[PDB]
Amino acid sequence: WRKWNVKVNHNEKRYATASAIAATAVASLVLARGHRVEKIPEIPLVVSTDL
Amino acid sequence: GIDHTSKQHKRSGHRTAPKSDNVYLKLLVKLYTFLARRTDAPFNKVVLKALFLSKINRPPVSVSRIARALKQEGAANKTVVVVGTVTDDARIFEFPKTTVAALRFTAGARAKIVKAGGECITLDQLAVRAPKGQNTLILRGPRNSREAVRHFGMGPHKGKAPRILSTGRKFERARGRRRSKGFKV
Amino acid sequence: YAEDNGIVKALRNVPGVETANVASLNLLQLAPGAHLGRFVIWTEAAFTKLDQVWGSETVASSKVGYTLPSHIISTSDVTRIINSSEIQSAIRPAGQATQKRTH
Amino acid sequence: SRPQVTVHSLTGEATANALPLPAVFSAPIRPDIVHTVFTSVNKNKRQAYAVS
């Protein structure tokens, strides 16, 4: 009966998902986590719907 | 073997840096350190102290106290500054036009101030519009009207709300609280 | 993706790649090891549906009782705000960076 | 004036169709909140272990 699972406030969980989505913008952060994207087109990369 | 008049290596007791790791707040501190160091006007060294303050010492400041400070004479064109949040208040209905600057505005306060024709201003825009703080106010919310501050200083004859969980009858209103049961206080 | 038509079975074998619906967007996939940043290959329908999902000033929420977080600062650049027009008018003239040792 | 990300086709060949940024990318990037929420959200898959 150790406290295994941990609550988060729902809005703070939403806050972190919003900040992470905002972080997959401009590629300073993207090159900061591995991610060999040194030559890609403009970031975010949006492929068309056929995929 | 120096005689010690006061205590050695005594930290001054204030904060010099906010304990929070809000990066954007570190940017506002990084701006106001510059402005406090070089503009050498008083208004800047007060807001720098206020960003250092904790959550408790930044109480939320309702929009009605802003309405009081604007009904206060002569301040009817000033830009009120609140370091800390500004929360809504449904008790006022009439509300003036002037501009408010703060860190955080709750959605009710944003809708209210923009609804009356005002403008919510993040403090960098006030640093742009007022480097020396021309024609401004500072409000501070009530600090010691917390829940917890009701409980400090508890002792006999001082009247400060004993620390208790469930109230009503039967929970600490017997001997020690009334004259009929033993003693009072 | 926005609308799954057999894409997850296509990419689920090639290692490292994880797919996601816009309705999910797990935090465990968007910042692994709590480090911000992923190489996110959006799709177009997913991009317009992202506009629908997380709200803006234009569309309202799609999550009951939600709006985006707000800025406590308008511009993330600081020295641009420091330099630009108004502040340098009020700034006293600077000293030396490191001080001369006197005595 | 959103930065107008161009849709890209499957063979490279950047299609001239441009789409605005959906203002989710103008959200504040708070690394610490992502950090604390990643800790407390990553804890939520643990099975219990115990001695007899």
Next chain:
Amino acid sequence: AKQSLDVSSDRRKARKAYFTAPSSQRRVLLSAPLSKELRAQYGIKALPIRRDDEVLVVRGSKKGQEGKISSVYRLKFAVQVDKVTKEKVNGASVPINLHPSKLVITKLHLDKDRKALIQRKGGKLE
């Protein structure tokens, strides 16, 4: 990736199902691939091993020696080809155990159940 809830990726369970499998599944674990000649002949990648096949070694210190199996030795997960031996210092000959996933089959030994077994798996035999 594992999709069913029926099979286990637990490592202990796999090695436990391996080292204590009974001999009837040890005919199945000791499958051996076929040559290119045979999969052009029969059209099938691999079969279980049997004691009379003519087989060739493709890995090890006996790489290239071919021969017939003498006996399949299912306790040690082994297969003793008759030509592959190691002489002992007192003059004797001791068969070297090979593992049949490292062999290549050249000539089979078809009776009925090898015939019907090839028929079940896409046979095109002669």
Next chain:
Amino acid sequence: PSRFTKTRKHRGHVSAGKGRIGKHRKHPGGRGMAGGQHHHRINMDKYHPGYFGKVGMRYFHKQQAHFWKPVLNLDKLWTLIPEDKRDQYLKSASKETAPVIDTLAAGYGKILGKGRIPNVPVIVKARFVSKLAEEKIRAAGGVVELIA
């Protein structure tokens, strides 16, 4: 958690934060609230004035449904009106279009007066009012209807 705890900073020290003289021992003052009228009387007087003794009438078989009475000051009383209708109702303050407020369906058992509602006459439907409450509502022009 335990990499941040202070016994992890106390390894190496013999008493582990608990002193050599008065050793850390099991329960030196008894278990729990023991001795409140005895050796701990100086803790029951101050910080707990009133803990010992009976007072009231006993109340057998209480039900909080008999005491459901959530109050409402006059100075909220407009959150109960929808906000998009609120500016319609504050403007053109007149009778025959007076708003109707049901305090009951919002969960408000009694109206209490607290001070200075605006001057728009408003029909308020409630279960209980106070003497200062109906006087302020009546001074605004609107009326009160007691419902059950």
Next chain:
RNA sequence: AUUGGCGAGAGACCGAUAGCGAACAAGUACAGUGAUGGAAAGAUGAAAAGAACUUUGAAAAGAGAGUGAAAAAGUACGUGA
């Protein structure tokens, strides 16, 4: 509802003085009139190829020779504090 039985699936669990008393012929060996108590004990090597043969000795073993990538891997066997 479910620390039992059967059949499964998993872990930010322990890793052999830990994890069940028991990873091994473990409720075993052994103690006790008895009720009951109750251990210790994993890993040579890919493969026994586990040292043919010569020589000293009553023999055990020795020293050569040989196996094996390696016997500072020889069954008193991973490393070996």
Next chain:
RNA sequence: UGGUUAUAUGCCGCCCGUCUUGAAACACGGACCAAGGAGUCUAACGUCUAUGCGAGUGUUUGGGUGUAAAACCCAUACGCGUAAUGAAAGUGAACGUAGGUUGGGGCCUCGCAAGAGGUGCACAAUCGACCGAUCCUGAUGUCUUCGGAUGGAUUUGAGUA
């Protein structure tokens, strides 16, 4: 030259741990070595910090869903909070730009500056006002014993302001 190490010489240096006013003790543990080995987890809370919203807040009892013990979304209620006080019946917070005065950060105006004046949030002190209780006063009307208006008191509360 210098470092390390052994030895030499000069001078110094009593076995550590522990209770103890006091230990090298003729006080107690310690022959030695390896591995094990002691302020943890939970329920409920206090102070302070950090975070999210903010007159509100808490998705996770449960439902929809799924790349399925995670993730994402959600209607109800419900907990705490926005209102106190009494044994209880009950009652229930603006006289007055939600007051006065004093001291107060900051701002504004004049002044070259020094200083003068206005404004004074937070907070301290103090006088008042309002709410509940208690002790009184007790009117217009009265199911003719009810109803309590008004006004008070070296009273009182863990209240409003």
Next chain:
RNA sequence: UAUGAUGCCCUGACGAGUAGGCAGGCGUGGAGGUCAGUGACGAAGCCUAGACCGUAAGGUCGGGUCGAACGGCCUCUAGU
């Protein structure tokens, strides 16, 4: 432009301490990310009056032995 603003630099004062409090770091088993890290042309461990770094916990290297896995860093965690 070219680097850290929880940096760099100037000035001054001061620095014993049991019980105890606080802060800054070192070390161990496991988890997420990362260095497209090391590794049977030899990991990890062990021995070493051989060498270097840190005030110290500790780190790093050279040699011998050895035979398969393991380390730095940003974070989580405890049967540390």
